[model samples]
Target: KSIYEFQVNAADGKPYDLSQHKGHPLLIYNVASRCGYTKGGYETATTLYNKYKGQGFTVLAFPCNQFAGFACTRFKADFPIMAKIDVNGSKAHPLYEFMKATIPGLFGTKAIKWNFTSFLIDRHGVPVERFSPGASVEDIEKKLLPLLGGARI
Candidate 1:
């Protein structure tokens, strides 16, 4: 199934519908507070979110502690920072796992490598691309521009 099928918990512990994001291009990234790449990726992501959120584009961050010691706390505490920074979490967020595993060219070898790794989903809930931790957010923006109707503002 596609990402729209899963329901994820918001920062307030409320269940939110993934399907609501349908027709909008989505950027899903795994984040961790302690990681070195957090700030840069977060900054770039927020910039992109602010630029395109009004134009049917969104960035969803899922905190994952699987790698290193990045995500140590549970989603309750973790989500607040995510909310402040505009992200999402509580494990892999079901859809995150699905896209990371099933999708071709996007799938990785094992669990997520580190924080700031990203997944790009099209308007139809299909994952179109994946980026490693080292990928620049500008590069992602270049790809997302066309998907978000040729970048307005």
Candidate 2:
């Protein structure tokens, strides 16, 4: 199955079908609400989403407890917050398994290095870019804006 064919669950365990986002571009990121780096990381994602949602862009956040669990409520985001899932290892969620496979991580590895491992999927339902935690929001914005405006990667 491709990206749209996979099913993910929300924080409350409600199933979310990727097909609902068939025609929209998406930013799918693994998150650890407690990670210090995530304080501004998700904030940037929120900023990006709020700025571009009108352009058919969205952020799909998956809360992972591999490193840690939920953080302060001050860290809430406006985007869809998905359930906790492993982004690497045999027990990984099927969706994440596809992401890492689609775009190899640092040093061509399939393993996610840290929280905020982000993947960008185009309207056609294919992941086009993968960003590590070190990648910045501005960098993502540069690549993402063009896709929303009909520019091809």
Candidate 3:
């Protein structure tokens, strides 16, 4: 059960196969524009992506309307933002379903608790860490550094 098994729609509505990102570490986040965490989350995510992209790192943002939602066009995000999808409930996207199940939330919970819930997957597409909405950029970066072939930032 790896992320490469999923094919999700890009913002343009075309298929964005996860397999294309083979051998790259990914930071996947469920983002909501209206949420209080949006600004810091997107900013930090963009910073991390920019700093390490050349090293084959990627950030996968999935906008979800299950929450109040955010206007994607308003943010000039450098990373790829995917189409709107459910992050919880029965309608949750398959990729998210895989993520939550692979790395259950606090107390063995399988459901996403709120927006900006993030997950990290290694180059092999296996889920690594689960970050809550409040996780700092430094927190995520610390885990990511080792995956980038031991590069320092």
Candidate 4:
């Protein structure tokens, strides 16, 4: 199974097809409510999105709370901030279920430990890498560049 096979809801509760982003490398991230990781994480993600969006790279941000709505307002995000979704346990979103299953956390743990955990999905919809909450954009770009045809940061 692939990310393109899953569907997620927008902030307004409207179903959005993940297939719409087909052919783009996705930076799928769980965000906010984990305050310390949020602000800087959002900023870096916004910067990354603005830099690579035109090159077929997309950022899909899912907030665990309302901070995504307000964070976008405060930070002026241009990327898609989807509806709040759980990242762990029985209620976790299906997309995340697939991701965690494909790229298990340290020690083979399937649970997402916290906010800012980012998954890098290749253009073909395969989940390729999982970044820890504190991973820098520089770190992400290192792995991401190759997927974007070796685009520079």
lDDT of every model, 2 decimals: 0.64, 0.78, 0.79, 0.78
Error of 2 at 40 (Å): 2.9
lDDT of 3 by residue, 41-109 (tens): 777788888988998888888877666633434434688888878877878888888889888875546
| Poorest 10 consecutive residues by lDDT, candidate 1 | 77-86
Off by over 4 Å in 2: 33-38, 69-75, 150-153
- What local lDDT does model 3 show for residue 18? 70
Residues 73-121 of candidate 4: C-alpha lDDT, one tens digit per residue: 3222488878878877778888889999999886647787766788998
Q: For model 2, how does the per-residue alpha-carbon lDDT over 1-153 read when each residue is reduced to its tens digit?
A: 469778888877888766877777899988875544645666778778888888778899887767553455523578888877887777998888887888886564788877777899988878889987667779898878778855555
Q: How many clashes show up per model?
A: 0, 0, 1, 0
Off by over 4 Å in 1: 33-38, 70-93, 104-110, 150-153
> Which residue pairs collide in model 3, if any?
33-70
Give per-residue CA lDDT, model 1, range 49-146, as digits (tens).
78778887777766554555423334322212232122223444456567767553433353565577778888777787877666776788777877
**Residue 80 of candidate 1: its Cα lDDT?**
22
Q: Which scores better on lDDT, 1 or 2?
A: 2
Top-scoring candidate (lDDT): 3
How many clashes does the backbone of model 3 have? 1
| Pairs in clash, predicted candidate 1 | none
Relative to the true structure, candidate 3 reaches a TM of: 0.86
